[PDB]
Amino acid sequence: STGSATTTPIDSLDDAYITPVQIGTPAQTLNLDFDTGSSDLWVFSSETTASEVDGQTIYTPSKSTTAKLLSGATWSISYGDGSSSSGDVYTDTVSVGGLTVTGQAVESAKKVSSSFTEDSTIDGLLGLAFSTLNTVSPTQQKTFFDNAKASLDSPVFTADLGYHAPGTYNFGFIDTTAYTGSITYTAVSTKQGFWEWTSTGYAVGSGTFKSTSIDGIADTGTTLLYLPATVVSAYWAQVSGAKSSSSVGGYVFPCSATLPSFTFGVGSARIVIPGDYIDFGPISTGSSSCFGGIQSSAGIGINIFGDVALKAAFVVFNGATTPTLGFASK
Template sequence: MAHYHTYTKYHRPAPEHVQKAAAADAGTGSVSATAEQYDSEYICPVTVGNDQLNLDFDTGSSDLWVFSTITPSSESSGHNLYNPNSGSSEQGETWSITYGDGSGSSGVVYADTVVVGGATVTSQAVEAATSVSSTFTSGNSDGLLGLGYESGNTCTPSQCQTFFGNFQSSASSALFTADLQSSGGSYDFGYIDASKYSGSITYVPTLQQNPSYWDFTADSDANGNAIGYSIMDTGTSLWYLPSASVSGYYANVPSAQDSSSAGGYVFSCDESLPDFSVGIGGTTFTVPGAALNFQPLGDGSGDCFGGLQVDDGLPGSIFGDVFMKNFFVVFDLGNNQVGVASQS
């Protein structure tokens, strides 16, 4: 595994014999996650067929789609491409996904080998894009690897199994973990690395009320405002909570205002933000104030956009990267639960 990680660290495809040896290592895998500017997303090296791609891991969706040689060049320029070859087979399926921000992609489906940090699936549905929206065209990722529940997959006429749905049968444990930080981080598949968290892990059951989502019930914030239905989502940059929680927090930030022009709460970049605490499964988790300053507006005003925003119009509260990069999070498919612990 150490030998394999050298290749992933330098974003190079490992030789086939190294991949196979790593895959046999107790049904586990571990992959590094690189933080993009302002921690807006985390991308990871993934081998798809014979190609090395950098994918955004998204627990809020269930499609593994990639830029490919059948993506129009006007949409794929600057990206690493998946090239279906003799080792792949077209499945006669199509797919089309639209995300909450209006971005999306669509295309056809191949079956090929996918390797994520040594975790290997030899006949994985790979959704090759024939059309990609501008949000992804201008981004740094070469596609998305959905880690949500299979029921949210968009393949038709038959749903495609997710990568982890396929891998779990050979995994040491049917779970994966996210250890995201401002400096980067990692995803581990099939095991829990005890060196990456401290104290105990607090688990809450998933509700499975919506396709794809790792949804659960959160308790309340430190001021007693109820939070309720929530989603743990690595594919969302910000943290969204009910209006009472968000307005109550920014009431303690003198320069904060709900800006119609910026589309959310902003404040002076010089502001020293207070910490913010929420309860999950009876345990209090505190996000440091510095983590709630998402990024400067870039308009010369000296204001910054808040990492905590109101969940109006969303399916519930979204615990995105602003929250998750401060904690060690377990996605336990075998027991249908989410776990949260302090990072070591």
């Protein structure tokens, strides 16, 4: 089997991407944030504290003839950005782009933090990291991909995120029309439960490539590119007037600037992030100070190849017995 679904930016800045997901019988379609940095499929629901729901579409398990309470199971998750959610668990039929999993754990939120409530466009998350990170207790549950894998034509999924435009998540096949050149594959460590890999270096603009190992995670659920302070300083030094602002929470730059590109290495291959992908717009409405899309990972504890990086590539998440990651230009 295969599946193919379009993923759409939630706003004009590509702050996140949503993908429609069918849950239950009859189907209830919710727009979920596919997140290769976590491993829970959780949804706003009829059980979510009413004051914490503000415009989201909810899953109502009592209206699904295939929903079953997973007795005694609870979940609770905290994300890198300080947000969180928790609740109980159902199993139900879940379909993405024509690919159906029966008995998928659907984690129903009883509580969500303010950032979730405040984002009306995201109805929940669909985790695509390794199932070892799944938070369901006392019996850990499998991700949608893990459940689908054996049925897939090939045990892979691909992320093809658009810049200010829709893109695609495919399951079970590689669309050879969706990228240019070849796909370069690189080793993955699953030790921390992430799609963790080592970039071979970087360049800023038309500058020379610096060969240096940068361990980080391919994370569709993180907006920005978070890299070591040395790398980030080298990038922003090429933008007149750019500075790190403690009050704002990172590097800012004059909105009048033209940003240089940023290149990262994948083995001997190179992925080029155009300068415009690095512009996250005014820090506040009407400001001429703009927020940068490349930020320091210092104090995160890990480097994160978030959407800013991934959307410059066609990315293969290869879930073979020994997982790997593939990157192609597009």
